[PDB]
Design a protein around this ligand. Structure first.
Ligand SMILES: O=C(O)CNC(=O)C(=O)O
Ligand SMILES: [Cl-]
Ligand SMILES: [Cl-]
Ligand code: NI
Ligand SMILES: [Zn+2]
Lengths: 17, 473
């Protein structure tokens, strides 16, 4: 069964650098 | 009992080519103009809706739930919540957390210590909206030393560090912490049958799992609405206080315009409103102090920003009441996010289908909104499926595993429901990258190097759709 790349959905704060 | 929606069989036969079943074209989401009627200056500093708990029974008083979700109340502060429930806030003290998981990952924001409720450019020349907040990472042990030693030192701007969005998601690592939170009334619990986010079926970190904040004075969370406009629950652990600034959902268009005018992105940017600008624009601002043990409920779509006044920790997560208002605002933001190329971390299509599987909905307005979403997406899926077969493009059964997350387009970040367009990751024959239909076709006109995976049996979706009917009250 094909393996799909994924990223963990996550709440996070803005960043400016 | 009147049905206004076609059956799944009728939807399917419509897609197989005469008359239309629905418009399908829809006014594009947009930011609201300043609310009408305008508020006079004497109404721009309203008191915060408050609940004063004394006894455990007070917290489980049913009307409390309805007070918090009332759309006219943008925020509710529930005073004395920890004390009423006899919650052991000590389980979330810096000392206790470090002892539990000394090496735990802590994301950090480094910021300038700004005076009062203001935000000045680094030279201290002029107030600006841009909020300098730079990312780094540390351990809970190291941030703890910084916080604790800070609390000793105290007793043209300084730099401070803020431990933020620390994930307390692992029940093995935080067993006692998380068990303590099951003492809460159902409507603010991280997990409950009445919480839409408990029907997602997979983890969204910080939304349906707990996040911790470790703060020193001046630590700021800049202006935002929650992801997909879900309500937020926040408990201050202490020992110090936090100050909250809140603007009603209806003014989010006005704040959006302020951001743009200050060359900042409303949805993704880092911005700290100038209260004097808001006052001149007749935007009302609720402002209050959250003490240790006080719970803050941020209603759906409420715009807010926060700063620590003392040294303290907070814990927080999202909840989604089973209401037309919450569902409407979540869908609106999902659609606006698409237009803005911003990822919705709540996969509203995936979620709506789970809601349809799991929840008997008795409110006609909410029922109609959900079924309308099912209709639009069922039609989109069948239409695409028919097109692909007409093109002789094969559809490979992929299915879903228990708890599998919703997938998103690696390019535009839109949720990709049911039919996944996948092509190999660079230099890999093992790993595949999900694309939406549009993005797949712009890489390959005819989908040459793409495979189409199907996650749900169409017969399954058709059944869920047909079985989703208005429940009796
Ligand atoms: O605690 C903070 O600094 C930020 N918290 C929130 O924005 C929230 O709980 O919704
Ligand atoms: Cl429950
Ligand atoms: Cl599942
Ligand atoms: Ni928030
Ligand atoms: Zn895409």
């Amino acid at each position: 069964r094909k393996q799909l790349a994924t990223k963990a959905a996550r709440k996070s704060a803005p960043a400016t650098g | 009992s009147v049905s206004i929606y076609p059956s799944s069989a009728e939807v399917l036969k419509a897609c197989r080519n005469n008359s239309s079943i629905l418009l399908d074209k829809c006014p594009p989401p947009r930011p609201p103009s300043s609310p009408y009627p305008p508020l006079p200056k004497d109404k721009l500093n309203p008191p915060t809706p408050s609940i004063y708990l004394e006894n455990k029974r007070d917290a489980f008083f049913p009307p409390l739930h309805q007070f918090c979700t009332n759309p006219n109340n943008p925020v509710t502060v529930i005073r004395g919540l920890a004390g009423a429930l006899k919650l052991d806030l000590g389980l979330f003290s810096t000392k206790t957390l470090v002892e539990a998981n000394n090496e735990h990952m802590v994301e950090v924001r480094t910021q300038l210590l700004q005076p009062a409720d203001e935000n000045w450019d680094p030279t201290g020349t002029k107030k600006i909206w841009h909020c300098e907040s730079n990312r780094s990472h540390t351990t809970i042990a190291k941030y703890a030393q910084y916080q604790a030693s800070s609390f000793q030192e105290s007793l043209p701007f300084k730099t401070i560090k803020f431990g933020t969005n620390i994930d307390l998601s692992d029940d093995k690592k935080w067993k006692l912490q998380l068990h303590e939170l099951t003492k809460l009334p159902a409507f603010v619990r991280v997990v409950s049958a009445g919480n839409l986010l408990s029907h997602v079926g997979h983890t969204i970190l910080g939304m349906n799992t707990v996040q911790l904040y470790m703060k020193v004075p001046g630590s700021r969370t800049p202006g935002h609405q929650e992801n997909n406009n879900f309500c937020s629950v926040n408990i201050n652990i202490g020992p110090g206080d936090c100050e909250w600034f809140v603007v009603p959902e209806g003014y989010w268009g006005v704040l959006n315009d302020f951001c743009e005018k200050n060359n900042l992105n409303f949805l993704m940017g880092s911005w700290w409103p100038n209260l004097e600008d808001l006052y001149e624009a007749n935007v009302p601002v609720y402002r209050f102090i959250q003490r240790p043990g006080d719970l803050v409920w941020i209603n759906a779509g409420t715009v807010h920003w926060v700063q620590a006044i003392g040294w303290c920790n907070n814990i927080a997560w999202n909840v989604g009441p089973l209401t037309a208002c919450q569902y409407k605002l979540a869908v609106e933001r999902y659609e606006w996010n698409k237009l803005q190329s911003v990822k919705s971390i709540v996969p509203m299509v995936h979620l709506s289908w789970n809601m349809a599987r799991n929840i008997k909905v008795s409110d006609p307005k909410l029922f109609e909104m959900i079924k309308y979403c099912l209709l639009r997406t069922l039609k989109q899926c069948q239409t695409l499926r028919e097109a692909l077969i007409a093109a002789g493009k094969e559809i490979i059964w992929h299915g879903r595993t228990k708890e599998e997350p919703a997938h998103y387009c690696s390019i535009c970040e839109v949720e990709v429901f049911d039919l996944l367009f996948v092509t190999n990751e660079s230099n890999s024959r093992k790993t595949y990258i999900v694309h939406c239909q549009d993005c797949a076709r712009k890489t390959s006109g005819n989908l040459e190097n793409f495979v189409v995976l199907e996650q749900y049996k169409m017969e399954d979706l058709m059944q869920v759709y047909d079985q989703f009917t208005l429940a009796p009250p």
